[PDB]
């Protein structure tokens, strides 16, 4: 059944397809390599992301020496079946330099990681926490009583958009209000958003 | 120029291409993966529209040039070895030519059609299925506004108590998940996508 599936992949002249490893919990692109028929099959059977190293001319499972495996949860093919997503959860940092992902060379800021909207805000909140030990985040990080009251009150306002039939944009605006203040509490308690999303996934 | 010096450091392959991945700036969903040469990257930067090189037609191709479903690029990233590119952008419409939101919807373990979703947006999709099928806790919350809102306020209370009562970080993590779930049932009631919420956060930068 695996044989019938690998035959459908559109490989290039070298027998390769693009294989992208993505964090199953956050969506961050960890790394992008290449896979041949055997590299994808090994990923399927071993549940650890495996690629074809063109340089070393051999199969390569991420973590085989460093133990920073990418435990693969699902594999996706795009429409033309020439691109692959390894959707996995990494044991440690993915890049061989030690960086969390391989993408940290911004072209517009001309070393910061590539972050989507939710994880960039978490990163900003983290920077305020470091400069703590005039900012609204620093004010919340330095006042537990104010932060907790703000979370309770904003949660109240989110519900009032449902209870009082406010516009959908009002609900989104208040959900953002809840999300920001909760992440300031997350930072105080040393909790990453990824850990929270892992909890959600474990409750499936 | 500074961009020219940046394109010069890019390690292009023998035919002058590099892998280009389009990713949703707000959610992280991978929209599509193509290939870019210097001019596809340079034009992507200048026009702020994701532009690739169509190898089959052997010409430049801007995603959306016919369908108007452009990918409006917010950032461009190079990986460590500088042979892989991420166009980080916000798409006008569905990216795949079939109409799918993204191009990646062929699960391999289900073959041994669902979109590839990460945890937060998979929970959003599940809550959405419960809303349409309306013995499940989500359907019950969708059928009782007073109960749903009571649970949100109660769970937001519990999250604060983990800070107030010096509870363990695992307790904070567990309670934050509780707040997130019940909030997303309220989002589904008000027809709010998580992406819409994250756009608001991004707009408050
Ligand atoms: N994310 C990565 N992308 C490309 N090459 C890598 C990556 N991580 C490690 N390597 C290299 O691949 C080999 C396997 O290392 P590792 O899988 O990290 O134990 C070593 O030569 C590493 O330097
Ligand atoms: N208290 C909770 N915290 C987080 N996720 C939850 C919770 N209750 C239900 N879920 C999620 O909702 C899904 C469907 O639940 P149900 O509507 O009871 O079938 C589960 O598989 C979980 O992912
Ligand atoms: N009231 C707020 N609601 C939502 N996001 C906020 C709020 N205040 C600050 N932020 C976020 O926190 C970042 C840093 O704010 P500050 O710590 O006040 O400099 C902003 O760029 C926003 O992304
Ligand atoms: Mg109000
Ligand atoms: Zn393709
Ligand atoms: Zn790397
Ligand atoms: Zn508010
Ligand atoms: Zn690379
Ligand atoms: Zn497509
Ligand atoms: Zn709880």
Author numbering:
A (entry chain A): 48 to 157, 166 to 188, 194 to 264
B (entry chain B): 47 to 158, 166 to 187, 194 to 264
Q: What sentences appear in the manuscript?
A:
The enzyme consists of two distinct domains, active respectively as a phosphoribosyl-AMP cyclohydrolase (PRA-CH) and phosphoribosyl-ATP pyrophosphatase (PRA-PH). The enzyme dimer is formed by two mutually swapped polypeptide chains, forming a bilobial protein—each domain forms one lobe.
In the MtHISN2-AMP complex, AMP molecules were found near MBSs in both domains, PRA-PH and PRA-CH. The adenine N1 atom interacted with the Arg263 guanidine group. We also observed the π-π stacking between the adenine ring and the Tyr240 side chain; the approximate inter-ring distance was 3.6 Å. The proposed orientation of the adenine ring of PR-ATP was rotated by ~ 180° in the ring’s plane to the AMP pose in the MtHISN2-AMP complex. This means that the binding of AMP to the PRA-PH domain in our MtHISN2 complex apparently shows the positioning of the N1-phosphoribosyl of PR-ATP and the plane of its adenine ring. The second AMP binding site was located within the PRA-CH domain. However, we did not observe a metal cation bound at MBS4 in the MtHISN2-AMP complex, suggesting that a metal bound to the MBS4 can either promote substrate binding or may not be physiologically relevant.
